Amino acid sequence: QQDEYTSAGNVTCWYQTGIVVPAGTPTSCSIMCFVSACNDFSVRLLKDTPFIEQSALLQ
Amino acid sequence: QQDEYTSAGNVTCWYQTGIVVPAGTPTSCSIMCFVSACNDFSVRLLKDTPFIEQSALLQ
Amino acid sequence: DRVRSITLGNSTITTQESANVVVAYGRWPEYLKDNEATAEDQPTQPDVATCRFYTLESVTWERDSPGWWWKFPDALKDMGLFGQNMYYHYLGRAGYTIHVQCNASKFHQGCLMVVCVPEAEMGCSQVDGTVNEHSLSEGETAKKFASTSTNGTNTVQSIVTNAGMGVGVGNLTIFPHQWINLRTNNCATIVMPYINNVPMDNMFRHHNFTLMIIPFVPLDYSSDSSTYVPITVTVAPMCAEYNGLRLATSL
Amino acid sequence: DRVRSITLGNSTITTQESANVVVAYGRWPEYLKDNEATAEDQPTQPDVATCRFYTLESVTWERDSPGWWWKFPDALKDMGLFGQNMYYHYLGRAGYTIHVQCNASKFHQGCLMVVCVPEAEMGCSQVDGTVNEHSLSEGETAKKFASTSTNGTNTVQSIVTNAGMGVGVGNLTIFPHQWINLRTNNCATIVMPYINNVPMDNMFRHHNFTLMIIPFVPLDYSSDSSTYVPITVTVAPMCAEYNGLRLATSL
Amino acid sequence: DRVRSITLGNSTITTQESANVVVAYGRWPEYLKDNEATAEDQPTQPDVATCRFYTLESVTWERDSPGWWWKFPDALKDMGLFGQNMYYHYLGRAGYTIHVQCNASKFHQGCLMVVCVPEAEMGCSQVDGTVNEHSLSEGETAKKFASTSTNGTNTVQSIVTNAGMGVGVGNLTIFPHQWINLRTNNCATIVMPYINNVPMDNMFRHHNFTLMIIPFVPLDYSSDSSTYVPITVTVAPMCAEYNGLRLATSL
């Protein structure tokens, strides 16, 4: 639950040259992004998650 | 300063088959040519060059 | 693996999209040996003035093109000193390196067969008739296969399906050959040794082999791709020998 | 053989279509040694805060584009801690790695020359005049070569054929250079050592080298291919040293 | 490195644009051992009549296609002798090799995810309801994911973003998977071992795994490029075993 004291920064992307295509090709393209953790990664202090909830039993 | 006695010949280029392109490509293309000397090359008899000249001092 | 360089005499060919090289029957050209010779005079061997690449004139591959053929020798009788050595001697002997070039873009399509046929004897369009040499060959200019059955006198029966020899054209793969598939490669190369039933022969009287170029898949392209696609042949003699020097013949 | 990776500091560049790397005269950058120094105070060497890739702003390659140039240093004087170390010292020294990127499709065409010229002294469009520094450089923004002879006062004579130096533009291959041929590669890389007649120098007063990007074959394309094709430069200093610490200068 | 050949039984697959092969969890299929068996009768092992590639029917990838799924087994219950051995026994066991093919030109674009999900239990579009087996599977014909929330009775809730399981579709990479990126490769291959909580099981009652094909980047093309682009699946069982022979069941 990050606050201003433990902030980590930002990521940005820019055109270094631009996209060049020949005739007969679609002009627009798309990029996809994947995330994962490295081999020095770890966590601690177990807690309950805020993503699941119920209003009564039998759910 | 080559004369008819020390002539060296000529160079020519021709289509061996022709240029073939698919649809969606520019038809015209261009070729470039570079010149250099081999490892058996040499010169002699120093002289002044005819490419630089002046009409008065301070030039 | 696709790049190749061939040097002969003062000529060199480079290529960047070659398949391989066909050596006709596993035999490279070579000179005549002593236990196989019959002519007794000392032969001449020019060795760089004759053994080099000569380029013929090009043809235009169109959307409906049946194919082309040349006859060897007699396509090199006006080529430098090879032709001059042909005119002054009675007997000659040589192998060959053939190189066919045709390039196109990745948006074109088509497939050519390049084949060398030894002793390709041809028939006349009139069955009660005989052929003449003008209908067989035009030197460095190519003869053209036809699209249907031919008629009239003195022309060769040249519908492509029979290859002008009374055979099926799909069986010509029995001879030394390669393919030019426009999506794969852009050149073919065949190395042919001397093939005959006698050790030497007269080069004006006898055609040793015919070169055939036949498209199986026609040329196709789309909206604004290049329309002009040429094909070019280049031939180099190898281990050339001559015997029987006299005054120059006249055709 | 075409894939390359370069790491400096906290920055990395990958490429999948590179030709090779040019090392200017066979010499890699290095620090100043003891038997070649003249300044006596201990120098500072930041070593990861200054030696890393900085990216400039991009230009648009159009169908009729004459070319562009930058001056180094003075194009990196507002770049992080390299610029701050430039402002507080009297003497500096560094080599560089330059990387130019421009990608396009297999249906485009064009050819660029990327060249680094040491001590590129330029002339004014008025022959009875002198140049000023605004006409020589705009920092991270590029100056533009022209299409014809230039006129008016205070501008540099910038017709591309003379490269603004009174030479033939086709001879610039005497300097360290590479080519970007759109059908072959999409990036150029040059490693430049420190080149001067003195071991250190002031970085605001002296331009050590000019970077020129000149298209020899213009950009061309067809019906509905992409029209926007940008070019991007990225530069990293190497073995950076500073001497003579005082208060910060002001331009 | 991109060419591959796979032989099983009397069938062979060649490919010239493959990425690699995924082995589900580092485990290859194998037969059941003696210290893990519970059923006592001698099992049958046909070994070439069942372990071979069977091809299903193809689907058409259109510009707005949500995706497709199949259930295994029950997609091979009418395939040769594998299906016949399924109908006469009570217990069966097998691993699989899956191969998905989709080719296109260098002027097309698109990206597909190919994933195998063990025990893919699905939900009904009515939340106070239960599913039936016709809505889960149609044998060799594919079920189709949807574009929005589904309604009506007896159909599966099939909006692609939730994958019909109540999860995020971008996390399905936790399972064995590959990608088909039209500019990179044209086929995917996954080798799946037997995965269950019991050593054998009945093949009509239990779906062991679901195969999902989901496009993340839709298919796009320009003026006169080909519009019809099909996708094809081919599956081969491996180390197939059966137990409990009786009369043939009837569905």
Side-chain angles (χ1 to χ4, degrees):
Chain A
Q1 174 73 256
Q2 278 200 4
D3 44 5
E4 195 154 71
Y5 183 69
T6 46
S7 57
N10 55 80
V11 177
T12 49
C13 192
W14 310 81
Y15 284 106
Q16 181 79 330
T17 58
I19 281 171
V20 182
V21 300
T25 288
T27 68
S28 299
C29 319
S30 58
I31 295 179
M32 293 205 304
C33 175
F34 301 176
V35 64
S36 72
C38 290
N39 75 331
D40 58 351
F41 205 97
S42 57
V43 292
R44 49 181 213 176
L45 202 42
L46 277 159
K47 67 173 182 75
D48 274 327
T49 179
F51 296 151
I52 206 77
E53 53 93 16
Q54 55 182 316
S55 58
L57 202 68
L58 171 53
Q59 195 182 315
Chain B
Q1 174 73 256
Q2 278 200 4
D3 44 5
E4 195 154 71
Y5 183 69
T6 46
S7 57
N10 55 80
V11 177
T12 49
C13 192
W14 310 81
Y15 284 106
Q16 181 79 330
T17 58
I19 281 171
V20 182
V21 300
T25 288
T27 68
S28 299
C29 319
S30 58
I31 295 179
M32 294 205 304
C33 175
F34 301 176
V35 64
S36 72
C38 290
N39 75 331
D40 58 351
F41 205 97
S42 57
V43 292
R44 49 181 213 176
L45 202 42
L46 277 159
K47 67 173 182 75
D48 274 327
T49 179
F51 296 151
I52 206 78
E53 53 93 16
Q54 56 182 316
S55 58
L57 202 68
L58 171 53
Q59 195 182 315
Chain C
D1 184 37
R2 282 174 164 279
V3 301
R4 185 167 294 278
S5 193
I6 303 178
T7 304
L8 281 157
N10 58 351
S11 59
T12 296
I13 300 179
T14 51
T15 188
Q16 294 193 55
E17 292 282 21
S18 72
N20 200 328
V21 175
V22 164
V23 184
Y25 298 94
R27 296 273 296 267
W28 278 83
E30 92 286 358
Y31 285 116
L32 182 60
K33 290 189 291 293
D34 285 346
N35 57 19
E36 288 170 352
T38 196
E40 287 170 353
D41 58 310
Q42 177 72 35
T44 184
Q45 296 168 358
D47 199 354
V48 285
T50 60
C51 303
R52 63 184 300 286
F53 283 102
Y54 302 95
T55 302
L56 321 175
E57 71 200 55
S58 298
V59 294
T60 300
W61 181 2
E62 296 167 31
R63 271 205 177 112
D64 49 296
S65 278
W68 311 263
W69 82 83
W70 293 259
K71 299 268 193 205
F72 291 93
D74 183 79
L76 311 177
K77 73 191 179 196
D78 312 299
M79 293 297 199
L81 280 170
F82 186 82
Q84 299 296 340
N85 274 268
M86 183 179 308
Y87 265 90
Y88 282 93
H89 294 92
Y90 161 57
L91 300 178
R93 179 196 211 258
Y96 301 89
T97 294
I98 300 94
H99 192 248
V100 181
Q101 308 103 14
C102 179
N103 54 87
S105 80
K106 287 171 165 175
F107 287 67
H108 286 80
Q109 64 182 32
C111 192
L112 295 161
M113 182 184 178
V114 177
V115 58
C116 293
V117 185
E119 307 273 42
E121 192 178 332
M122 292 171 162
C124 200
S125 69
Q126 310 284 78
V127 289
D128 314 275
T130 49
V131 299
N132 283 318
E133 74 270 14
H134 174 69
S135 283
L136 295 170
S137 178
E138 277 164 335
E140 321 178 351
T141 309
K143 306 302 293 182
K144 277 168 183 174
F145 282 115
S147 80
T148 49
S149 177
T150 53
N151 283 273
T153 186
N154 295 142
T155 182
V156 165
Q157 178 57 254
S158 46
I159 175 170
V160 296
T161 46
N162 285 326
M165 297 188 282
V167 301
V169 72
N171 287 332
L172 286 185
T173 50
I174 194 52
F175 297 123
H177 73 291
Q178 265 190 340
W179 303 88
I180 295 190
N181 196 2
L182 279 188
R183 61 175 282 151
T184 294
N185 56 312
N186 56 25
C187 66
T189 309
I190 297 176
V191 171
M192 195 88 157
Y194 185 75
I195 297 170
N196 207 345
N197 69 313
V198 291
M200 296 184 76
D201 212 5
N202 180 267
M203 298 191 142
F204 282 89
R205 204 156 57 162
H206 184 197
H207 307 311
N208 283 317
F209 68 87
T210 299
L211 167 65
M212 292 178 182
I213 298 182
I214 297 162
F216 282 1
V217 181
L219 178 82
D220 212 12
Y221 50 88
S222 294
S223 66
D224 75 332
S225 279
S226 300
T227 59
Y228 175 70
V229 179
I231 309 176
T232 298
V233 192
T234 295
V235 188
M238 308 162 75
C239 299
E241 266 179 340
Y242 308 86
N243 261 308
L245 178 77
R246 75 285 191 275
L247 77 162
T249 178
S250 179
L251 275 184
Chain D
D1 184 37
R2 282 174 164 279
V3 301
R4 185 167 294 278
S5 193
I6 303 178
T7 304
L8 281 157
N10 57 351
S11 59
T12 296
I13 300 179
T14 51
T15 188
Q16 294 193 55
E17 292 282 21
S18 72
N20 200 328
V21 175
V22 164
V23 184
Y25 298 94
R27 296 273 296 267
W28 278 83
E30 92 286 358
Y31 285 116
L32 182 60
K33 290 189 291 293
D34 285 346
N35 57 19
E36 288 170 352
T38 196
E40 287 170 353
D41 58 310
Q42 177 72 35
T44 184
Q45 296 168 358
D47 199 354
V48 285
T50 60
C51 303
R52 63 184 300 286
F53 283 102
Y54 302 95
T55 302
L56 321 175
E57 71 200 55
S58 298
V59 294
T60 300
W61 181 2
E62 296 167 31
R63 271 205 177 112
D64 49 296
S65 278
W68 311 263
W69 82 83
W70 293 259
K71 299 268 193 205
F72 291 93
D74 183 79
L76 311 177
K77 73 191 179 196
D78 312 299
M79 293 297 199
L81 280 170
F82 186 82
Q84 299 296 340
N85 274 268
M86 183 179 308
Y87 265 90
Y88 282 93
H89 294 92
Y90 161 57
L91 300 178
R93 179 196 211 258
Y96 301 89
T97 294
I98 300 94
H99 192 248
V100 181
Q101 308 103 14
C102 179
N103 54 87
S105 80
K106 287 171 165 175
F107 287 67
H108 286 80
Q109 64 182 32
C111 192
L112 295 162
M113 182 184 178
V114 177
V115 58
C116 293
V117 185
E119 307 273 42
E121 192 178 332
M122 292 171 162
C124 200
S125 69
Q126 310 284 78
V127 289
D128 314 275
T130 49
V131 299
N132 283 318
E133 74 270 14
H134 174 69
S135 283
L136 295 170
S137 178
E138 277 164 335
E140 321 178 351
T141 309
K143 306 302 293 182
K144 277 168 183 174
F145 282 115
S147 80
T148 49
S149 177
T150 53
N151 283 273
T153 186
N154 295 142
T155 182
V156 165
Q157 178 57 254
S158 46
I159 175 170
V160 296
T161 46
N162 285 326
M165 297 188 282
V167 301
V169 72
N171 287 332
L172 286 185
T173 50
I174 194 52
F175 297 123
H177 73 291
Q178 265 190 340
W179 303 88
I180 295 190
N181 196 2
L182 279 188
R183 61 175 282 151
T184 294
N185 56 312
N186 56 25
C187 66
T189 309
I190 297 176
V191 171
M192 195 88 157
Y194 185 75
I195 297 170
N196 207 345
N197 69 313
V198 291
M200 296 184 76
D201 212 5
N202 180 267
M203 298 191 142
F204 282 89
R205 204 156 57 162
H206 184 197
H207 307 311
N208 283 317
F209 68 87
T210 299
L211 167 65
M212 292 178 182
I213 298 182
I214 297 162
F216 282 1
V217 181
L219 178 82
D220 212 12
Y221 50 88
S222 294
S223 66
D224 75 332
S225 279
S226 300
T227 59
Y228 175 70
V229 179
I231 309 176
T232 298
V233 192
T234 295
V235 188
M238 308 162 75
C239 299
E241 266 179 340
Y242 308 86
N243 260 308
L245 178 77
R246 75 285 191 275
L247 77 162
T249 178
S250 179
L251 275 184
Chain E
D1 184 37
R2 282 174 164 279
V3 301
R4 185 167 294 278
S5 193
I6 303 178
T7 304
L8 281 157
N10 57 351
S11 59
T12 296
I13 300 179
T14 51
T15 188
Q16 294 193 55
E17 292 282 21
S18 72
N20 200 328
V21 175
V22 164
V23 184
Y25 298 94
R27 296 273 296 267
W28 278 83
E30 92 286 358
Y31 285 116
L32 182 60
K33 290 189 291 293
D34 285 346
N35 57 19
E36 288 170 352
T38 196
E40 287 170 353
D41 58 310
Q42 177 72 35
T44 184
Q45 296 168 358
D47 199 354
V48 285
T50 60
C51 303
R52 63 184 300 286
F53 283 102
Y54 302 95
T55 302
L56 321 175
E57 71 200 55
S58 298
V59 294
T60 300
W61 181 2
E62 296 167 31
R63 271 205 177 112
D64 49 296
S65 278
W68 311 263
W69 82 83
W70 293 259
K71 299 268 193 205
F72 291 93
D74 183 79
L76 311 177
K77 73 191 179 196
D78 312 299
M79 293 297 199
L81 280 170
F82 186 82
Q84 299 296 340
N85 274 268
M86 183 179 308
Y87 265 90
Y88 282 93
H89 294 92
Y90 161 57
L91 300 178
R93 179 196 211 258
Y96 301 89
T97 294
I98 300 94
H99 192 248
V100 181
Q101 308 103 14
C102 179
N103 54 87
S105 80
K106 287 171 165 175
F107 287 67
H108 286 80
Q109 64 182 32
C111 192
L112 295 162
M113 182 184 178
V114 177
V115 58
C116 293
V117 185
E119 307 273 42
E121 192 178 332
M122 292 171 162
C124 200
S125 69
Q126 310 284 78
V127 289
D128 314 275
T130 49
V131 299
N132 283 318
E133 74 270 14
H134 174 69
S135 283
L136 295 170
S137 178
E138 277 164 335
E140 321 178 351
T141 309
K143 306 302 293 182
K144 277 168 183 174
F145 282 115
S147 80
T148 49
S149 177
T150 53
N151 283 273
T153 186
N154 295 142
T155 182
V156 165
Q157 178 57 254
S158 46
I159 175 170
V160 296
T161 46
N162 285 326
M165 297 188 282
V167 301
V169 72
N171 287 332
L172 286 185
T173 50
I174 194 52
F175 297 123
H177 73 291
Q178 265 190 340
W179 303 88
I180 295 190
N181 196 2
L182 279 188
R183 61 175 282 151
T184 294
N185 56 312
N186 56 25
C187 66
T189 309
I190 297 176
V191 171
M192 195 88 157
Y194 185 75
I195 297 170
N196 207 345
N197 69 313
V198 291
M200 296 184 76
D201 212 5
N202 180 267
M203 298 191 142
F204 282 90
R205 204 156 57 162
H206 184 197
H207 307 311
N208 283 317
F209 68 87
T210 299
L211 167 65
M212 292 178 182
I213 298 182
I214 297 162
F216 282 1
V217 181
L219 178 82
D220 212 12
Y221 50 88
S222 294
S223 66
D224 75 332
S225 279
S226 300
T227 59
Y228 175 70
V229 179
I231 309 176
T232 298
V233 192
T234 295
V235 188
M238 308 162 75
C239 299
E241 266 179 340
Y242 308 86
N243 261 308
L245 178 77
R246 75 285 191 275
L247 77 162
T249 178
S250 179
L251 275 184

